[PDB]
A and B are shown apart, each in its own frame.
With several copies, the nearest count.
Chain A
Amino acid sequence: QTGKTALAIDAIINQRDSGIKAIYVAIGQKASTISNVVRKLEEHGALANTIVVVATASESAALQYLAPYAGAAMGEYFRDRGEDALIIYDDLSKQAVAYRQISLLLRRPPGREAFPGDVFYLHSRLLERAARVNAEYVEAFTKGEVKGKTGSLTALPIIETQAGDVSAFVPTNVISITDGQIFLETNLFNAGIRPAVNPGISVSRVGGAAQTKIMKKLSGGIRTALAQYRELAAFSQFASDLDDATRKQLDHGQKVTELLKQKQYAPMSVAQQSLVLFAAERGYLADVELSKIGSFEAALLAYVDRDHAPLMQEINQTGGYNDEIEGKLKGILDSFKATQ
C-alpha cells in the first residue's frame, strides 16, 4: 500500500502516444482488482496499446509461475521486430512463491527460505531478456525487412518487502539482477508525500544518458538540493536563527520537496516538467515558498498552455535546450509572476 501499482500503471498510461507498446502482467492479483485497473486503463486513456496478461490468485501455481515468461515472449516479439516496448511484472515475489510451491510439491531440495536452489536463475533468466538490441541483430532476425532500427524491451519489475526488509532472499536477488531501483518508502506515503520516492537510496545505474537534454540540464541541482535538505531537515525540527546561507538552503529544500508531488492519474509531459523544474531551479519560487505551490504549478501550466503552446510543441518534440530556450523560459516565468 505505497503506490507500486499506481506508479506502474501511470507509466503505462503515459505511453498512449509514444511508439512504446506496453504490457502489464498481473501475477496472483485478485480478479476484482485487475478489473478495476483495466477499467481505469480504458477510461483515463488507452488500453489499445497495452497487452494485459492475467493469472489470478485462484489459478494454479504453474500458471502463475510461467505467466511472466509468457508476457516476456509477447514483449520479445516487438523487440525482435525493431519496435520499443515496456513490460511491467507485478509482484515478482508472487512468482517466487508460486515456484516455491511447485518445487516443494515436486520434492526438490529446499534452500534458504525453502525457496529452491535455482530461484536466482528464475528471475535472472527472466529479466536479462529485457534489452536494447542493435540493428545488425534486428536485421538478421527479420531477414532484411527493417534495416536501420534498434528494438528494445524496458522492464519494471515490482517487489514487495515485508516491514521494509531489504536483506530477504528474493529482494536481494532481484536487487542484484536489476540496474537501479525506485525505492518507495512507507512513512513518506503516510505523510502524504505521494509519490513516496526516497532519493539517496533510489538510484539509476544507467545515469543521465537516458535523460533528454533539457531534463538533464534542469535536474542536476535538484539532487543536490534534496541531499542538502536531508541533512538540514534535522535542524529544521527544533532550531532557528541559523546562518542565512543555511536558512535559504533549507527553505528551498523544503519547497522543492513540496514541488515533487502530484495527483495520481495526472501524467506530465516533458515540457511541463521542464518548466516547473526551471521555476524551482532559477529561483522563481524563492519568494513563493508557501503552501500555494500546488496552485502555483496548476496556474503556471494553464497559463503556459493558454499563451505559449508552440514552445510546448517544440520541447515535446525535441527536448532541446540552449540560450534561446533559456531566455524564452525566463520570459515566460517573468510574465506569469505578474498574474495570480
Chain B
Amino acid sequence: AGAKDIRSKIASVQNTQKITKAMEMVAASKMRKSQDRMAASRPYAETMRKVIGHLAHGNLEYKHPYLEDRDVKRVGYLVVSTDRGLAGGLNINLFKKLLAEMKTWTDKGVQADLAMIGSKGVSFFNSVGGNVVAQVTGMGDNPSLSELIGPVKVMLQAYDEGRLDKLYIVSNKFINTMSQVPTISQLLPLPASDDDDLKHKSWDYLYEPDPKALLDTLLRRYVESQVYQGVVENLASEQAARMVAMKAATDNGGSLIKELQLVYNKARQASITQELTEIVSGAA
C-alpha cells in the first residue's frame, strides 16, 4: 500500500469513470442521428429490393448475369467494420461468423474475395490472411454512398468479368435499441429462392427501349442501395454497442473506487497506530 499512491489511483479512476459517463452521452446522441437516418433509408431500399423480387419471377424473361443462378467457383464478401475501439465485440463477432462461412467454402475449395469498409476489418483480415481485394476506411460520422461506390465498383467488375460468382454483404442488424446481431446476406446473385410472383401472375414484364441498358442501370442501383442501407444500419449498431460498453466501464470504475477506498482507509488507520505506539514507546 501507500497513502499517496493509492490516493493518486483513486483520483485517476474517479476521473476515468466520469469520462466514460460522458462518452455514453456522445454515443447515445449519435445513436439518435444514426437511427433516424436509417429510418429514412429503409423505405427506398426495401421497396427497391421488392421491385427486383418481382422481376425475379414472371415471364418475358430477358437473360442477365446477375439474374441467373450460376455455379460457385469463388465467393465475394462486402465486409463493414468500425474504425474505432470501445464498441465491445461487435466486429469480433461479425468477423468470426464470416470466418466460419469462409471456412465452409474453403472446405469445398471455393476461394473468398473480401472488400473491407472499415479499418478494423483491414487490420484483422490482412493479419489473419483473407484476400482483401478492396478497402475503404474512415468514412466519417455521416457516411455517404459516393465514397463507398469504388469498392463496390471493383466487386462488380470482378463479377461481370466473370471471375466472381457469388456475392454477399456481412453486417450487423439493428434489431433493437439494445439488441443487434451479425448477419451474412446474399446480395448480387438474385436468389430465385425468393417468392414467386404468383400473386400478380397476370403480368409478363415488358420494356422501354434497350432492356439491357435499363435493366443494367436498375441492378447497379439495387446493389448500391443494399450496400448503403447495410452500412447505415451497421453504424446505428455501432453506437448502441459503444453506449453499452461505456455503461459497463462506468459501473466497473465505481466498483474499483469502492474497494480502493477500503484499502486506503485501512492503511491510514494502521499508519496512525504505528505512530503514537512509537512515540509512547520512545517517551518511555
Give chain A's interface residues, CB within 8 Å of chain B: 109-114, 163, 167, 234-235, 237-243
Q: Contact flags (1/0) for B24-45 with A, using CB distance below 8 Å?
A: 0110010000000000000000
Q: Establish whether residues B279 and A239, one from each chain, have CB atoms under 8 Å apart when the complex forms.
A: no
Least CB distance, B242 to chain A, in whole angstroms? 13
B19 x A163 contact (CB < 8 A): no
Q: Within 8 Å of chain A (Cβ to Cβ): is B272?
A: yes
On B, residues with C-beta under 8 Å from A are 4, 18-19, 21-23, 25-26, 29, 85, 123, 268, 272, 275-276, 279-280, 283
Chain B residues, CB < 8 A from A241: 29, 123
Closest to A107 in B: B283
Contact A240 B123 (CB under 8 A): yes
Minimal Cβ-Cβ distance residue in A for B25: A235
Knowing A110-B283, A112-B276, A113-B275 are in contact, say whether A237-B19 is a contact too (CB < 8 A): yes
Q: Are A239 and B4 in contact (CB under 8 A)?
A: no
Name the B residues within 8 Å of A110 (CB-CB): 276, 279-280, 283
6 A-B pairs closest in CB distance: A235-B22, A239-B26, A234-B22, A234-B18, A110-B279, A114-B279
A contacts with B: majority SS: loop
A242 in complex: contacting residue of B4, B29, B123, CB < 8 Å: B29
Q: Are B22 and A238 in contact (CB under 8 A)?
A: yes
From B18, B22, B25, name the one whose CB has the most chain A CB atoms within 10 angstroms: B22
Please report the C-alpha to C-alpha distance between residue A242 and residue B29 in the assembled complex, in whole angstroms.
8
Q: Which residue of B85, B123, B275 is within 8 Å of A238 (Cβ)? A: B85
19 A-B residue pairings within 8 Å (CB atoms): A109-B283, A110-B276, A111-B276, A113-B275, A163-B4, A234-B19, A234-B22, A235-B22, A237-B19, A237-B22, A238-B22, A238-B23, A238-B85, A239-B23, A239-B26, A240-B123, A241-B29, A242-B25, A242-B29
* Nearest Cβ on chain A to B64's Cβ, whole angstroms: 42
A112's partner among B23, B26, B272 (CB-CB below 8 A) is: B272
List A contacts of B21 (CB < 8 A). 234
Contact residue among B29, B123, B268, B279 (Cβ-Cβ distance under 8 Å from A167)? B268
Residues of A within 8 A of B85 (CB): 238
A sample of 19 more A-B contacts (CB under 8 A), given A238-B22, A241-B123, A242-B25, is: A110-B280, A110-B283, A111-B276, A112-B272, A112-B276, A113-B275, A114-B279, A163-B4, A234-B18, A234-B21, A234-B22, A237-B22, A238-B23, A239-B22, A239-B23, A239-B25, A240-B123, A241-B29, A242-B29
B23 CB contacts on chain A under 8 angstroms = 238-239
- Complex: chain A residue closest to B26, CB-CB: A239
Determine the chain A residues whose CB is within 8 A of the CB of B123 once the complex forms. 240-241
A161 smallest CB distance to B (angstroms): 13
Q: What residues of chain B lie closer than 8 Å to A235, measured between beta carbons? A: 22, 25
A237: nearest chain-B partner, CB-CB? B19
How far in angstroms is the closest Cβ of chain A from B82?
12
User: Least Cβ distance of A116 to chain B in Å?
Assistant: 12
B18: which A residues are within 8 A, CB to CB? 234
Measured in the bound complex, the distance between the Cα atoms of B28 and A239 in whole Å is 13
Question: How many angstroms from the CA of A243 to the CA of B19 in the assembled complex?
Answer: 18
Question: Which residues of chain A are within 8 angstroms of B29 by Cβ–Cβ distance?
Answer: 241-243
B19 surroundings in chain A (CB, below 8 A) = 234, 237-238
Q: What residues of B have a CB within 8 angstroms of the CB of A234 in the complex?
A: 18-19, 21-22
Residues of B within 8 A of A109 (CB): 283
A residues less than 8 Å from B279 (CB atoms): 110, 114
Rounded to whole angstroms, the CA-CA distance of A237 and B16 in the bound complex is 12
B18 closest partner in A (C-beta): A234
B108: shortest Cβ distance to chain A, in Å? Answer: 33
Chain A residues positioned under 8 Å from B25 (CB to CB): 235, 239, 242
